[PDB]
Amino acid sequence: TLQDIGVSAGINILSAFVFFIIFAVLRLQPFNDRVYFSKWYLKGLRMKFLNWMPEALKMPEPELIDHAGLDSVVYLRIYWLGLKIFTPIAVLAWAVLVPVNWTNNTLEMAKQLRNVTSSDIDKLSVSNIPEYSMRFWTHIVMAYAFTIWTCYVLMKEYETIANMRLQFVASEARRPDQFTVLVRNVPPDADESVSELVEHFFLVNHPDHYLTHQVVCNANKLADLVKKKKKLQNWLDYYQLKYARNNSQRIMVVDAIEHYIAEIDKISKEISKEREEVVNDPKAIMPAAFVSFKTRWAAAVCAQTQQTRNPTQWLTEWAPEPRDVFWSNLAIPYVSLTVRRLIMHVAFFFLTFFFIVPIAFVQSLATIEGIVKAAPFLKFIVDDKFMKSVIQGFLPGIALKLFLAFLPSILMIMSKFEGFTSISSLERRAAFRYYIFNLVNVFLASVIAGAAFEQLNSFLNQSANQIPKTIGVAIPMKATFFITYIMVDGWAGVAGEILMLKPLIMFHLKNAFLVKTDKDREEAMDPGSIGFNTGEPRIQLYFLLGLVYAPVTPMLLPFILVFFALAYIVYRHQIINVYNQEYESAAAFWPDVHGRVIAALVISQLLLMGLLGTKHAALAAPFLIALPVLTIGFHHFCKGRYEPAFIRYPLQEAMMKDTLETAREPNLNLKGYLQNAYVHPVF
Amino acid sequence: TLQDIGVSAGINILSAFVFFIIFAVLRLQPFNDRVYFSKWYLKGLRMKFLNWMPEALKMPEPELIDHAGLDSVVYLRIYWLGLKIFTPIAVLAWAVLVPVNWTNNTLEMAKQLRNVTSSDIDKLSVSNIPEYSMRFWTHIVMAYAFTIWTCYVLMKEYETIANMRLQFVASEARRPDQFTVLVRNVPPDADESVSELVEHFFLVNHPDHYLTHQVVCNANKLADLVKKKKKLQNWLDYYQLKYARNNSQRIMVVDAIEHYIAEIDKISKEISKEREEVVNDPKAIMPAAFVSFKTRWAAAVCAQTQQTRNPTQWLTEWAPEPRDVFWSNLAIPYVSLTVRRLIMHVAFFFLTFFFIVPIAFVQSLATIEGIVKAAPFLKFIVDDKFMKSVIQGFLPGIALKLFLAFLPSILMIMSKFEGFTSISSLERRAAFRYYIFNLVNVFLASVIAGAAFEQLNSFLNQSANQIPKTIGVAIPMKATFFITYIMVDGWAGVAGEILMLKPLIMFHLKNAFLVKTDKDREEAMDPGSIGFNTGEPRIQLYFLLGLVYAPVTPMLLPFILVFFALAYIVYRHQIINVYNQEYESAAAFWPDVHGRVIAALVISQLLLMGLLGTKHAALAAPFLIALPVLTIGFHHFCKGRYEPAFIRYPLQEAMMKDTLETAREPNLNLKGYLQNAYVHPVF
């Protein structure tokens, strides 16, 4: 379907450059300066179409770290890791595997019983290599030449990030983070509050340091009413400022009264339940607190060591950041966390079940050649030499992207059902859930449940006879669908995101209908963070499509390369200019990303075993079992030598930065800075 | 072979009671009071044949803990855990599975092609149940009724040991252990010694507490010469005290001179290389030290947390005990440890290879019925109705025990090749190595490489036809060999060890030939510890033989029960009276024992799957895959809720015991107690 892939990529490229032209025109308007330069406003300072790509590369990395942050820079380093990995894989896959496969005409042996393709398998892989053949001694050493070298890149980068983290976090500005420990669970007592329990624990066990504890209020209903009150005042602005350019009888459902008396009701509830939260309710005081110390060393001790007999009471997390704590999940009791997880492993098992139907509905539309040759009817979807290319190359990608346009938000809500009192861990487990959802339905339940449609004459006319051989041929045949998915979802989806329409339309609507001046900068935060819910494991999906199909057909490799090369420039321009970073992690997600790339390697070799086990290659599988040993052993090496720069904060640097801070500024209290830092953002 | 099993067990029992009579006679001699009551001498105090079993049960467990120790009591609790587990397994295996199997005469259908047994499979298991049958719905729920209940016992005991440990170690007497941390690796420097590196590290990072460091001398050659000097003075005592009851021309090889001038040579070397060890040799000062603190809290902090950037420098162990530190392995450089491990995984792979031949040489002797019916010759080993029982029931156990009479010492040496600077971890990894050696050669390479001999007519006359079915029948047929191995190795081996001949003969020889008085108490320590190299994973071998054959033939279960019931009384008498305990761990080996029993459970269900997959039991395997999920999930539960009472010493108890000790005795230094505690036992 190269006649189809060319048309699909042509539509995608000649729409993506339309997006670039629209961005180049619409950026230079003077009114949208608050949109496309919003982070510059957040830092407190007010023909030649693509003349922004060289501007986004002039700024060096340490100035970017001191300007943007440390999460987004290493997020760019994910894309540079992708460009580093897949360049020589594609180089050694062009000049080696393509002269191997183009020679032997085994799918020109097509009138073996029913296998009809055209002029693409001659560029494809092991399907074109016949049974028990001699060509496979190429691929396996190329397999080594892929998985030894990518482990070298994954070692070198994961060295240059732990060093990068330890250089950053031992020199960043003082937060009220590095002195504070969450004390998540605590046993009840006949004492009148949790506060004296935390006092008589930490005065006895940490008698020297112990700055000031702070318990966690419930405040769920109160914050929900504050959110509803602000939303109601937003509509009270909208309906009332329609009247300032109109006449009497304003609204319909006297009627402007029908929000302001509701405002009086809500304020009468606000003052009541804000009075009735910290006066008469010890019941609304959850068993948790934010303790605090006067050295970073003491908090580093307190939040790494076992505290008591039970490893369920007094357990200490690292107290994320006061602008990072996802409140209204500190109000979940601890003993009901493991229930809420086991619920959302079941419903996730449903989300890998209900979404199989919109997967297969794609591929039946994507391989109508696999239906026309398998079922005689042509007054329906018919070969017309051009609309076949549209129905097989463009609409499957658009359809599969539009079925995925909601599920990052769904998995974000589903992670919010569990506790995870930080945005910085909600986004990590949301990325993990969307990675599993891409690995099951977008990859496996696409390939297995679609290649049966793609070779339906094989399963139809001659059943249960060569059913390993047909499904072994059909998996490298299903690279064209991922080519189109790259060219639609990744390619134009990163080439169309620059024109940030979903915040810009809302910004114009809030310009046109609000009150007055002195408010035109709260909506510059409406472009949120980088997509770590959305765009983070999409990268790992393309890593999976690269590494799985690297000893398999190299027609996914150059498209992955140009996607990475474009998205690096796109996201680097975005991180320089339009991004917020509502949390400093800092880059504490590489034990997840590195692990998922290693799991992509392991799945790559375990699927290469399945592809070599369908051509009766006898002495080919024994020289491939060494790789799931070698990669998992390399992962256990990296889990020991580099990962405890991410988990365990060492005490030498915790004392070093403390003494350096007491050399920079002496003689300031921390109680004026940090005693009232973790009070709920109601108060 | 019940006619053979009865004769084997009769010989073993009627020799074991001969051992008990010899012990009862030889104990009441007045001269061996230093042997069979040696621990009572170590604690500083000077018809009715089996009248010692009720005496060994009168003493309650807390007095035993305050008398013997805390390792040996929980070592007895291993045997009581065995008696707790396998009693209702045998009860519910008699009254359920034996009326199932005795009914259906499918091995009385014996003239299916070549299968000849006699009157034992009617008591055995799934071999006697025919293909795709209805009896198996018993066994699987009995499988649940074994693996749910044993996990309850493994939860309850592992609760009553972590509580037992935390009650003991938070109330024991003061050692110079709980204040001391080994600092195993340290980077070099242009500074003149490692001592100033340890000083300028710990004064800066732990400025409050920091009692006194102590570096580790090399002292290998010096300690080897001290050992040779003491051995040479032992022979200098022996040859000279032969002269005190003889005449001139004493020895042969003037000749008594031929040891005393060698003594002068050795002392001239001792004073030289003891002078030339701490004066002119910074090269002989290894990069390690024993740091020390003045609170237990500070040492608990120092030996749980990451120290620096690298997790290879300044890494901190727990500094075992000064009478526990296996010296001359602190003199191994750290960077050469991982080489020495990877050597001794290879040679261990050789020890699982060379010892296959003495395994199979046993079973060919053990199943001559499987050779006579498979190879016509009878002027060799012949059926004579009694010597068949001797050659099949007694000599395989004796032969297999005598091939194993050296390998605990071999694995002890092999663990000494690695570093492991404690006896308390050398014995743990020696127990792990001997567990793997029992699981591979004594269990798997016995069963697979012997059942082929046991059904050699099946593999001979009709080959490659029912080779899953024959090897599925033959594995429950190979329970009689483990019956005899229990009755020889375990049974009489624990019933014959009471008469502790290997220290007693040496004690009589050292009484007859040494110098004078004032020396008759150093040889009471010659009975060493409990067998944790030798006798610890023998228990787990019988756990494996119980749990694997519990849904399989219950003719191993009562013999395991009476072995446990006898060995509990035997080892409890021994631990009360004759044992030393050269190290207090205290019971820090249950994450190993609990893990190996859980692995025995997992191997039990994964071999039960293999036994059900040989009778074409279709709807029997799907209701058995849940158990390797359930047991490993239970192991991940116990690794989280109970294990960090063994690994991570909590800080609340470390401050509690410190304040209680300062309430018991105030105002004593630790430098008079602990500054010179870890100097090498040369000095």
Author numbering:
A (entry chain B), B (entry chain A): 3 to 48, 70 to 276, 288 to 717
Can you quote the paper on this entry?
Via genetic screens and functional analysis, the osmosensitive Ca2+ permeable cation channel proteins were identified in Arabidopsis by two independent groups, which was named CSC1 (alias OSCA1.2 according to the OSCA family nomenclature that is used here) and OSCA1, respectively. OSCA1.2 and OSCA1 share ~85% sequence identity, and they both can be activated by hyperosmolality treatment. In addition to Ca2+, they are also permeable to monovalent cations such as Na+ and K+, suggesting low cation selectivity. Members of the OSCA family belong to the calcium-permeable stress-gated cation channel family (entry number of 1.A.17.5 in Transporter Classification Database), a subfamily of the calcium-dependent chloride channel (Ca-ClC) family.
Here, we present the structure of OSCA1.2 from Arabidopsis thaliana (AtOSCA1.2) determined by single-particle cryo-electron microscopy (cryo-EM) with a nominal resolution of 3.68 Å for the overall structure. AtOSCA1.2 forms a homodimer, similar to nhTMEM16 and mTMEM16A. Each monomer contains 11 transmembrane helices, in contrast to nhTMEM16 and mTMEM16A, which have only 10 TMS. In contrast to nhTMEM16 and mTMEM16A, of which the dimer formation is mediated by direct interaction between the transmembrane helices TM3 and TM10, the dimer interface of AtOSCA1.2 is exclusively formed by its cytosolic domain. Despite the separate biological functions and low sequence similarity between the AtOSCA1.2 and TMEM16 proteins (~11% sequence identity between AtOSCA1.2 and mTMEM16A), structural alignments reveal that the last 10 TMS of AtOSCA1.2 share a similar fold with nhTMEM16 and mTMEM16A. The ion conduction pore of AtOSCA1.2 is in a closed state in the solved structure, as revealed by pore radius analysis. The conduction pore is constricted by a set of hydrophobic residues, which include I393 on TM4, L434 and L438 on TM5, V476 on TM6, F515, F516 and Y519 on TM7 and L575 and L579 on TM8. We have also identified two long helices in the cytosolic domain of AtOSCA1.2 that lie parallel to the membrane plane (named ICα2 and ICα3). In AtOSCA1.2, the hydrophobic linker between the two long cytosolic helices is identified as an unique structural component and may serve as a sensor of osmotic stress. In the structure, this linker protrudes into the lipid bilayer as an anchor, and its partial deletion impairs the opening of the channel under hyperosmotic stress.
